[PDB]
Design a protein around this ligand. Sequence first.
Ligand SMILES: [Cl-]
Ligand SMILES: [Cl-]
Ligand SMILES: [Zn+2]
Length: 164
Amino acid sequence: LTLNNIRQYYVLCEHRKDKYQALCNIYGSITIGQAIIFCQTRRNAKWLTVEMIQDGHQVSLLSGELTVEQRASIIQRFRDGKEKVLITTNVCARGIDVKQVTIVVNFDLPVGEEPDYETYLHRIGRTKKGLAFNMIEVDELPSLMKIQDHFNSSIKQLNAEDMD
Ligand SMILES: [Cl-]
Ligand SMILES: [Cl-]
Ligand SMILES: [Zn+2]
C-alpha cells in the first residue's frame, strides 16, 4: 500500500540553528495544516520544541520519556487536529500519519553507518501530492545519495529561497 508518490527535497544546513531557520522559511512559504517532524535524538527533539514554542507554533512532542497514557493523549489530540506540529523521535509514522498532514520533515536523516531505508519509507511514504524535506549537513549527502538510488526517486535541492 506504501509508495513514494510525493515531492522530496533536501536543504544543506551547517548546524541545527540553520535547520530550524530553514524550517521557518518553509512555514513562511506555503500553507501547512499539519506536519510531522522526525528527530534522531531526544535532546534534539526537545530543543526544536522550545524553539517552536518561542515562535508561536502549537507543538506536541513524542519522545520516549512518555508513559502509555501520555502517548495516548498526544497522539489522539494530533489526529483530531488539536495540535499542528508533532515532533517525534519515533522511527515510524504508523498511527499518526493522518490525512491532514501535508508536510513531513526529517530533521535528522534516519542513519552503524548505513541509512535506514524502511525507516525513511515509513516516515515519508503514505498508505493528491505530499511534501517531504530532509535537513542535512553537507557530509550527509553520501547517505542521501544512496537513499535516492535505493528508491529511484529524485530528492531535489533547496536553499534559503523556497519556490513551488
Ligand atoms: Cl536520545
Ligand atoms: Cl498500518
Ligand atoms: Zn512502522
